[PDB]
Symmetry: D2
Subunit: 343 residues, 4 copies
């Protein structure tokens, strides 16, 4: 930026290596960053009481899997409490993942704040004091961060104020992260409220992504040292029209290549409620698109990698091998369907 | 405002009464909201060490003046610690001010954050967890809040990013305050940071105010329940060209009436380094301008009201009568030069 | 603007004198600028054929009125063909008005252009070649110009694109006019397509005006040398509930004082289909508002000053004095109800 | 969009085929669209007088080349006067090019207009009446159009106003062109005025392109049916340090892939005074870049394809085959570079 650049050559280089190594060889991201309430909601499906010990146990099973998981998982997103826990043997989770070669990341948003004068749409809190938190995390073996911005499709939604505020919050987050050495993961998530179709979701996603990357350019954010976590362009789950993997893949790649620059090293997809098989098939169809796709499309999956694991665990011991294999199978399936090599 | 208004009729009415009552009859604002470092800097000039007891004592003298100070002071801005401090007889400072009829306000920004890729330009932190703080203050007998945004005039300053981010932060602050019932005091302060002239400072102030009120309109902020705290349009003290009260008054009123709507009940001026006599004469000349001036121009003075009080106190007891008279006289002089009646 | 000001002291002074002299003593604007199709539509109501001769004759009757009309009319907006017409003798219409003391203005837009991807929303053409036309008009005894931008209220109307494009077109027009010495008359007209409410119309008008003056500030437009021509906040003819002059005045002044700066010398209102009596009563109620109103509210009326004139003329000969008296009566009534003196 | 899309499936498909066929197999664009003054300036270098007959003759030599030129040239940009000329025979120039397989395009901007309050930076005229002109050209066998917007690098240049106005003008141009069936060629040209750096030029180009494509998305412009005509990130002729083809290539592609979406079918480069050999070497180095480059990089060259042609012609008769061979050689070399196969 001539006289006042945001980063230096070393910082840009380090950010690019981190961002590329997360998605280096078809690898994805395990999103084990659920909060206390989110993890309680996930645990309620298998009649397991929500407590810190259960979260520690399940995350220990997730992070103590066979060492051939760096071939399918390149990064793990964590929560603040989960990063500092210990396994049963007495070493840190962030070190177990580090010796496996998996890159470590942290959730960095503090939540939602109502936006007055708007139809139930919010902005994201977490910006004040984020630089110190990011510096502490970078000291504490964390290489990337994640920030989620929710934009809803409803009557008069998303408004110009919501789009502008969310895009600028994501851009300021990303600039802070890159200033502290962390790779930012922008997650502009478009959630439909009323009934809609594929074309409207694609249009709104294109608008959101255009505003997001315009804000990122405005804040001088290094695009080669950041990742994108968008939702796949789908419809409301309470809709008669069920879209095949081909139509979803065409819609999402069409939305992405119109708005997302080629400087972004990789686009890791979220789930947002899709089944594991549907997410895998959709991502496989995404990677089989004839469109340019100048990025490394991959997965940043939550429930999709932790649905059979929860069912196999049940909150009980002696199911460690079953949970580890259930997570192994889903990780391998998504890694296969991150290069268009899934049957 | 057809389907999703920001406020209701009762909230709008209450905000308008609070904002007008702050500046009802030529009354101003005493800015006794200096932080620990700021109050230490103020105390250092009279050989008094900075401590929590000295800050308690001086504001104890300031808030224990004769009851005929509501005729000159309509609002007092406090700090978080000073709000909960108590009088020597065991009464809260905010309760003392409330029985005197003076409206209570609180500083509500958490500080400055560097803006990457900019020439030493900063944004303002304090937005996350501001609704809860404002609700707590409203339950705690606080009726208005203040938020400062600093814009500098330098090489390639202010940039578009700085103006946009600061204006949007001020607008989000104001919307949060109005949602919690507090009257927001926008303080866009354009600091010189150079040897620029009156024309450039006036131009930059007009740009800042236009962007600030555009952002306020974007965030649906009730303009009748806000106050503005702008700097008087002056030049950098490094430059050798002085400006008479007439030139300063013409420049600042010219900048204000091109950008500040008539809905704003009153414009209270800050000082930012002016002497007490200079501030009084400048505000007198401001209120003697032939221009329309649809607001109630007043003062929101810090050091300007607490400079002779510091010199009369000296950190010692038995001089509190001189401290009260040096603040009584200065407040009365500014109230007199808040309606063009000062000789 | 320090290093690169838009205008000089002489240009700013001349623009301010022109703009103030248009609205000097409660005087309004006669909007006799109907195009060929528009004037034909207005002539069709009295069963007279549309031709250039009839247009010349009726405006000859309008401009051949007693020289006391300078006490009620301060400016006349003409069309391009009407400006160069003659008064049946060797003296032009523009000179007829100039020796009468009335300021001369010209319509300066070419009109609607479809805006793709929008719900029937349009932008305004006229920008290319505007500087040369404005210079020619200024050489031709024209002192102000007018530009109309239409924004509609409908489903997803007004959109952000329509608001931004129309505001920027108005600002670019105003900058060109002030560069050529003409006083620009911004006419942001909000037309409702459906059954709207008073609150919705007020909110949309505030948004439009805030964006318009933000764009005007962005383009460095001298606000003291320009006029505003807004529509009163009213209801459509299909609205179930009628709005009294007090309510319309309340909504109009409330919308104006939150967004229109005090630098604007005067606000001249348009009609947009309201009757002459209703326009007069509404403008009287507007000028009787207890709100600040730092401008000189007046009228820029079209059909409201040429409704009884058309009905008295009828296209026939020797029915001139009736047209003269009707136009004089309407102009005097509106001038009386431009300072709150109309009973 | 869901309810108000800019184009239909047939219009989008036709625009896609036209835009891709212009750049189908490494083919470029011959920019023989010089205006009367521009063509006179280019003719003055070989001591020939400027007249319509000389332009007709030289355009005849350019368009009467062997039919294998469709293997190197996929589109020709013409002027309004040039499109309607004849081949000294029955056939028109446009039909001569059409039966050669070359796509036809037209210049569509009226040109610079001073932007008041700015440092000598202008906006572009041509928007009013553009829809009718584009419809006439589409009826006249013209398949694409071109529009140039100039932004300067100087003190306070480019300003926010210049960037925004030029980007929005380009977007409105492109939307009109796509509504009329023409493929728009955006030409955001950044020209330095002074002594700049490669880093500064790259940064300014990135900001310009980000704003341009944000405006294009704001106006709902089909990105798969448009082309981009940027200048290579180079240095001025007064720059102390010369930049190698490798450095220029990297800077250009680095600027392009951070801001230009993958939906854009091809990026055709201009010359801007860069010599014929340097343009070919730089384009070959650009096409040899290891960066993603999801587009079809090619050339839209003016003087670069018409410098040896002008020197071989000299305005004399019977010096035609030399001009044919020079133009063929330059076109073939630039096509080889556009395929990255130029040695």
């Amino acid at each position: 930026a001539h006289r006042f650049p945001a980063l230096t050559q070393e910082q840009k280089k380090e950010l690019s290596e981190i961002a590329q190594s997360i998605v280096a060889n078809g690898k994805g991201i395990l999103a084990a960053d659920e909060s206390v309430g989110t993890m309680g909601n996930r645990l309620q499906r298998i009649k397991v009481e929500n407590t810190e010990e259960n979260r520690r146990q399940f995350r220990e099973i997730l992070f103590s899997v066979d060492s051939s998981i760096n071939q399918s998982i390149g990064g793990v997103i964590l929560f603040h409490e989960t990063l500092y826990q210990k396994d049963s043997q007495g070493k840190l989770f962030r070190n177990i993942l580090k010796e496996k070669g998996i890159v470590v990341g942290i959730k960095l948003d503090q939540g939602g704040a109502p936006l007055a004068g708007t139809n139930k749409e919010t902005t994201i809190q977490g910006l004040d004091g984020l630089s110190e938190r990011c510096a502490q995390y970078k000291k504490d073996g964390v290489d990337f961060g994640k920030w989620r911005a929710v934009l809803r499709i409803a009557d008069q939604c998303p408004s110009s104020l919501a789009i502008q505020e969310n895009a600028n919050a994501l851009a300021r987050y990303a600039s802070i992260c890159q200033q502290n050495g962390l790779v930012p993961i922008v997650e502009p998530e478009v959630i439909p409220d009323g009934d809609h179709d594929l074309e409207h979701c694609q249009y709104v996603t294109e608008k959101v992504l255009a505003a997001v990357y315009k804000a990122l350019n405005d804040h001088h954010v290094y695009l080669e040292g950041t990742l994108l976590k968008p939702n796949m362009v789908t419809a409301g789950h309470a809709c008669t029209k069920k879209y095949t993997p081909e139509q979803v893949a065409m819609a999402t790649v069409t939305a992405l290549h119109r708005t997302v620059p080629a400087a972004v090293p990789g686009i890791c997809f979220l789930s947002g409620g899709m089944s594991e098989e549907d997410a895998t098939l959709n991502l496989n169809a995404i990677n089989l698109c004839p469109l340019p796709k100048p990025w490394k499309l991959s997965f940043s999956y939550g429930r999709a990698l932790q649905a059979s694991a929860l069912a196999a665990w049940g909150g009980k011991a002696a199911n460690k091998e079953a949970t580890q294999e259930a997570f192994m199978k889903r990780a391998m399936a998504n890694c296969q369907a991150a290069k268009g090599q899934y049957v």
